[PDB]
Structures are given as C-alpha cells and as structure tokens.
Design a protein around this ligand. Structure first.
Ligand code: B12
Ligand SMILES: O=S([O-])[O-]
Ligand SMILES: [Cl-]
Ligand SMILES: [Cl-]
Ligand SMILES: [Cl-]
Length: 405
C-alpha cells in the first residue's frame, strides 16, 4: 500500500518506545492510560510483559470505578472516574489483547458507552443545532470502540455523525475509522451506501487540509490521519502524492524529537508499524515485537545550563496578569507555571487527561461549558503541545487566553 510507512529507522522507533516505558510503572488511577497500551500492542515494540500487569490494572480500575453501587454512601462523588471517551479507549485496549468484552460487568460497560452516545445524539438533537457535550472525536471514538467489539449502535446515533461529516483532521480521521469499521463489519446495512459516501468525504477533507510542509493539519494530526488513510479502498494519484508527502514530512520531524507526548507517541507507533485502530476488528496477538529494555542512563552533564528569560501573560479575563521568569532552558511551560505560582501571585489548576495535565483554571477562573484555556506563543500563534510538553524558547511570551469555542 502507498499510504503505509514502509521505511523507518529501527533506532528512531526504539527511542519513541523508550519514552513510553516509564509509564508502564505508573499504575495509579490518574496515570493509567488505555491509549498507551493500544499504541504498544499495535506497535513493533514490547514493553516487557509489564504489559499484562498494565491491562490487568486497567481492567480492575475501570471496573471498580464505573460499576459503583446504586448511590455511594454520603458524598455523590468520592473519586473521579474514567470519562466515557476513556471507556471507549479501554474497549480498544481489550481488543489489543484479542479480547471481546463480555460477562455482566462487560455488558454494563457497553451499556454505559451506549447511553453516552445516546445522550450526545440528544445534545446534538433534532436537526443539528446543538453540540455534543464532549466532541465528535469522542463520538466517533465511541462508535469505533463498539464496532471493534461487534456491538451495534442505533442507526439514529450513527446518523448524527454521518450528517456532521456530510454538511479537525483528528476528528475527520476518527470519524473515518468508525465509518471504515462499520462498513467492514456491516453492522448498519440500512445505510451501507451513505457510510461509503461519507468515507469519500472524509478522505477529501483530510487531503484538502494538507499543509505546504506535508502535514495533514499539523504534525500531530498526521499519525491519526495516516491510520485512516492506509485503509485505502480509493487508491488514487492525488491520494498517493499526498501520502508520500505526508510520510516524508513525518519522518523529517522524527529526527527532531518532535514527539514527546505519551499519547502522541501511542498514536504514532501503530502507523510506524503499518497498523491502525481499525486493525482492532481482528488483531494479530501472535506477531512478535522487539522487547524494549530500560534505558537507565540520562547523560550527567555537571554543567551550568543556559537560562531562558520568558514572559508569561494571561488574557481573556479581568484583570490580565503578566509574569517574568528566568528558568533553565528546556523547562516546560508547566514548570514555569508551577514556578510562577510558587514565587508569585500566579495560580492555576490542571486536571488529568490521557494527554497529561490539561489546564482547566487560571488565577481562579475555571473554564466553563464551551470555554477553554488556550495556550499561545505571542503573537497569536496557538501552541501545538500542552503545558507539560511545551518547552519554551528564549525571549518568548507565552499567553494563557480564555477562549470560547
Ligand atoms: C477535542 C480536543 C480538544 C478540546 C478539548 C475539550 C473538549 N472539547 O472536550 C479543546 C478544543 C479544548 C482542546 C484544546 C487543546 N488541545 Co486538543 N484535542 C482535542 C482532540 C481532537 C480530541 C481529544 C479527545 O477527546 N480525546 C479523547 C479522550 C478519550 O481523551 P482525554 O484525554 O480524556 O481527552 C481530554 C484531553 O484530550 C483534553 N485535551 C484536549 N486537547 C489537549 C491537549 C493537551 C496537550 C492535553 C494535555 C489535553 C488536551 O481534552 C479532553 C477532555 O475533554 C485531540 C486529538 C487527538 N489526536 O488526540 C486534540 C489534541 C490532544 N489537542 C492538542 C492541543 C495542542 C491542544 C491545546 C494545547 C491547544 C492550545 N494551543 O491551547 C489545548 C489544550 C490547552 C489546555 N488548556 O491544556 C493536540 C496535542 C498535541 C500534543 N503534542 O500533545 C491534539 C493531538 C490535536 C493536535 N493534533 O494538535 N483540544
Ligand atoms: O483539538 S485541540 O488541538 O484543540
Ligand atoms: Cl451501569
Ligand atoms: Cl509531543
Ligand atoms: Cl486557579
């Protein structure tokens, strides 16, 4: 296939995998990450049989938390649990171990995911003058996750996604993979034609989105886009060119340590192994993988490091707030934040996600329903990495801006 990453330096891939290895020891309820486990299982890499403990840890945790009694005694809360989109990835984790969801606990969970989608269908509503409470990315994730387990969704639910696509790149790709999955499964034959037409649309909007550099959307949407695109069934001359450009562009960033984020790597590894979430319909759990071994190194400089002087600014609320910090080069935005909070009038709050610390609140202002804290490098360039991964350059002005999407 033309859209498949054929050539990859084994030592590049080994490095990426090594970035995921430490997370296999990180088994707390907030650190457990179904997306990492899927990423590895579909990769050419193995992270010890630490993997088995991981999946087991997931299993126990996603069950204990989501299947809690009729009304829990005296709180209405005690412990944040997995989101429904996360549950969809848990379902993917299961397939990656060649398991179908089952038994009573597994039925209850499929139900939960089904109720999720229904509630989103209703939030959208009627004739689409409404937004999912989460997003169409999670909507598609949900349909996809049930599809790989041979579980059918109501035609009405699937319609909502189909309409959305018929009338970004990451959501295109996920919607695409859901569609691809439903076609290959023939789970909704009563709209078999409409789904096909939707994939052509999806493909189109992705290539349309390609940047001069070769990226579909940006470097980070690229892995997910390639996952959907290696599924072909429309192989063309424009599609071949696009994929060739996209692939070279992606390999180019791999020599620049561009991928640092565990979730991002977990979306990248399958691509480097000619695999996609759609391969979870029937996974090959017999296929060998190279064992990753602990690095155990990290070169001790004993140097005096460069410092960056960086300026932090908060906008989109009254009052705005600036802050001046000098920190070691390679410090992350998150380090700079923690520092500002520690040595200054700054404060902020993050909450866990599978991508890591999501910035939810700044200076006592929590983002609401359709608001979020955007992070940008001034002037008006939105960052492509989160607070923990983005390592500011010298002189930069970093803006935390409360926006209404
Ligand atoms: C939907 C979405 C959003 C929504 C999330 C709110 C919502 N509507 O639910 C919005 C639009 C707010 C958003 C914001 C941002 N996003 Co976003 N987002 C996505 C998308 C499409 C899906 C995420 C999702 O639903 N995951 C599924 C569920 C199961 O995962 P989850 O962990 O439970 O989901 C939560 C987190 O993903 C969190 N979140 C969303 N984006 C990001 C980014 C980072 C770095 C972190 C730590 C968390 C985070 O929002 C979800 C909770 O609702 C992904 C695409 C992808 N390829 O993964 C990008 C993606 C994760 N986002 C990304 C980026 C860059 C950002 C921002 C930093 C943008 C910016 N310049 O400010 C911010 C985060 C800022 C902050 N406050 O911390 C990148 C990450 C790249 C990387 N190297 O890690 C992705 C991959 C998109 C891309 N291709 O560039 N995002
Ligand atoms: O989808 S995220 O990049 O805002
Ligand atoms: Cl239930
Ligand atoms: Cl990254
Ligand atoms: Cl805060």
């Amino acid at each position: 296939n033309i859209c498949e990453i054929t050539e990859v330096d084994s030592t590049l891939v080994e490095r990426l995998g090594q970035r995921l290895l430490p997370w296999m020891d990180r088994l707390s309820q907030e650190q457990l990450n179904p997306s990492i486990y899927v990423g590895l299982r579909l990769s050419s890499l193995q992270a010890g049989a630490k993997e088995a403990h991981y999946l087991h840890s997931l299993k126990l945790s996603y069950q204990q938390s989501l299947l809690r009694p009729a009304s829990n005694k005296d709180d209405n809360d005690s412990e944040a649990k997995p989101s429904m989109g996360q549950l969809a990835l848990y379902l993917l984790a299961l397939r990656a171990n060649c398991e179908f969801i089952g038994g009573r606990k597994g039925d209850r969970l499929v139900s939960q995911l089904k109720r999720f989608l229904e509630d989103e269908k209703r939030a959208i509503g009627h004739n689409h003058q409404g937004h999912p409470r989460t997003s169409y990315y999670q909507y598609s994730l949900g349909i996809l996750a049930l599809c790989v387990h041979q579980k059918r969704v109501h035609d009405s639910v699937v319609g909502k996604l189909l309409y959305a696509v018929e009338h970004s790149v990451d959501t295109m790709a996920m919607a695409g993979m859901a569609f691809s999955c439903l076609e290959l499964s023939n789970l909704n034959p009563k709209q078999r034609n409409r789904i096909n037409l939707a994939l052509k649309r999806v493909q189109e909007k992705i290539l349309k989105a390609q940047t001069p550099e070769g990226y579909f959307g940006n470097v980070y949407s690229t892995p997910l886009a390639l996952q959907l695109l290696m599924g072909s069934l429309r192989p063309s001359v424009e599609l071949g060119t696009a994929c060739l450009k996209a692939k070279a562009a992606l390999q180019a960033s791999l020599q620049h340590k561009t991928f640092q984020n565990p979730l991002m790597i977990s979306q990248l590894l399958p691509v480097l192994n000619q695999k996609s979430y759609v391969d979870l319909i029937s996974p090959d759990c017999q296929a060998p993988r190279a064992l990753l071994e602990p690095a155990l190194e990290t070169p001790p400089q004993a140097k005096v490091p460069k410092f960056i002087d960086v300026l932090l600014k908060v906008s989109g609320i009254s009052p705005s707030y600036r802050h001046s910090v000098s920190v070691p080069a390679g410090s992350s935005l998150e380090d700079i934040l923690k520092n500002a909070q520690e040595h200054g009038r700054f404060r902020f709050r993050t909450q866990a996600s599978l991508s890591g610390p999501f910035l939810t609140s700044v200076l006592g202002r929590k983002a609401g329903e359709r608001e979020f804290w955007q992070v940008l490098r001034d002037p008006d360039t939105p960052l492509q990495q989160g607070i923990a991964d983005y390592r500011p350059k010298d002189g930069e002005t970093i803006e935390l801006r409360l926006v209404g999407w």
